[PDB]
Amino acid sequence: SERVVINISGLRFETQLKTLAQFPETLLGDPKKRMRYFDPLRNEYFFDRNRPSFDAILYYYQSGGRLRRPVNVPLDIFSEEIRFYELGEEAMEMFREDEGYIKEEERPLPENEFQRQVWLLFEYPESSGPARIIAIVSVMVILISIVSFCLETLPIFRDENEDMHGGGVTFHTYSQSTIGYQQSTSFTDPFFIVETLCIIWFSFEFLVRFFACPSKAGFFTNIMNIIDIVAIIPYYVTIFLTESNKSVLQFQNVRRVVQIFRIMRILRIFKLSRHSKGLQILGQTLKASMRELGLLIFFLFIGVILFSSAVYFAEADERDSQFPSIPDAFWWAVVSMTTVGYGDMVPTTIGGKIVGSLCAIAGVLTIALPVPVIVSNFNYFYHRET
Template identity: 25%
Template sequence: MRDEQPGYLRARHYFYEILESQAQSSRAGVIVNRFIVFFIVLSVGVTVMESVPELRNGYGRLFAALELLCLVVFSIEYYIRIWIAPEHLPYRHMSPLRAAWAYMISPQGVVDCISVMPLWIALFGPDDLRVLIILRMLRLLKFARYSSGMRSLLEVLESERRALLACLVILACATLVSATAMHIVEGHVQPEKFGTIPDAMWWAIVTLSTIGYGDVVPATGVGRLIAAATIICGLIMIALPVGIVANAFSEVIHRRDFIVNWSMVARVPLFSHLTAGDIAHIMQLLQARQIDRGEVVFRRGEPATAMYFIAEGEIEIELGPEDKGRRIRLGTGHFFGEIAVLNRVERSATVKAVSRTRLLVLDGADLRALIAREPSIARKINEIVEGRTGRNLNLEIADLEGQADVTVEESA
């Protein structure tokens, strides 16, 4: 079959690296990403300008040509993403058809599908300009794939969904209570505004979500007291979700200099044998750090608090006098700093960046807990380091019930 031809698979992996890895070291990936972002902006800009009658009458044909060009670009991108779906780590155990379907029903796949729907609606569907305008504006959602800020925000909303849901429940309760109270107090005075609880709920929602109470003013003294209490509750209701999201967003931004994604973690050989669920768990533990050329990661003699994985770039390890000051260079996919962390000793080498480098940082406590959860990682560390240095580090797990206690016979 064609899928089994090595050249076909190499081509599919190549396009996956360009479209999905988002590696800044890949010039082709950077160019393609910027190219797609340009067409997203162009498409939305054309949609906005077409709403102006003077511009639509004067440049209608140009706008139509630009929209067709955008649709062609988005269609090609969509079909390529369907083709490369089996390269995604969560879909690698699936058949090509199942992987393609899994991508198509994923949130990003749905957004990509929406981006090309105006073409098919225009060709085969009803000529409803309003539907086309809405679908074309939804292309803005594609920015989530290319914007680290938007991806961080989505990550925050996902992690804080329970707290935000609790805020929504509290808001619903406050809306019902204030609407019921105003219906009882003001219903006979302003029946057209507060005659029913559903009518009063509109006033309650506006009052809780804004400063003041909109275009409906209470007529009774008790109604004004209820309105004042509702306004105060509204200030609290606004502050709660804003505070939750702002605090979590700030933590994510300060913790990570860039977004940790599936392909970044999957590129690390130490994690290549893990399941998609394990990878998802590790992604939550990893912090991201970006360092410039010549910048020191850590120095010899410093306390060891974390191990590092090289997502992109290259580092140089300067060993101590006991190793005659040898220098070792490691590139993308390698890791370092694990032995001192597991032995709970000071660093025995100085590490600096040879080029602009992206590092994934795993805290020492998280590393020991991860080994306790997945003992095969200890064996994998031993194999990789032995292949790198020729030394058998003999990593052993002494206690898997709580926090793993790992001993290392030699430190590096």
């Protein structure tokens, strides 16, 4: 149990030789490595180094593994010490995980020479200057893509057709309403033009990315690539559906589906997350807050049902009750709780108003509980970047 004295810039430490010998490959554990620091006049090893850190270095040996950084010691300074005492990469990596880090993975270029050259200006706006031009063009198309989709609903456009004054409904006027634009190899419709140009680009990005892609396995894994597929599925599925049902009775029979896919086109907005750091952070945040997000919805649900029931009964004996049933009152309850208060439904009796009062207050508290945590997570991911 030979004792060993280690002097760190004057701060004296002692331990047993067998304690250091526990880790044979480190500096203090290897006789040949520490030999350089021995002082035969004082029978001690001397290191002209940072004092605050060493307490932890020695404890690492004593505890047989625990490598905690002292709260009062900067991470950059402590890491340098860990490397000097040669604790090894295994314990260092293990140290960084606890210090909150980990990760740092992700394959590089395609490696296919040219395939790894395209996968640069279509996945890394960084690289070439033109690679940035592609990004700018992508964003443009997306925005245009969105504006287009929106104007499609503008009455000033769809109210300028064959049955705008209450006349007869044509097949190509019925499907032109259900889709938003009119499909035709004649490209007469401006909307069908822009929409088609945008889908060409989106279809291009998807394909280019899919071939210049290194790991074909981890493609439909990346949520980003998923967004790119969903941003074009409506377009082609619409064509298929209309062409597969070219008659009035047939189209009408598949009109619900077609409508769904038109709604699904809005998801193209999420095609901006690839070019938006903040949007990506928000995603990470929501993915990391599922529990509280669920708690938030659950708590609201509980309150809604409670207050909807109470308001209903408190206004039950009224000829002018604005609450037809409990399920009807749900709308009012959520509107009051989130404190939106549209005013389209309001209690009129004393009891109903007392109930409404508590409903507003309760709503304020219900929401105020889970959100702080969510806000918290967001603040994390937002700064762990910058």
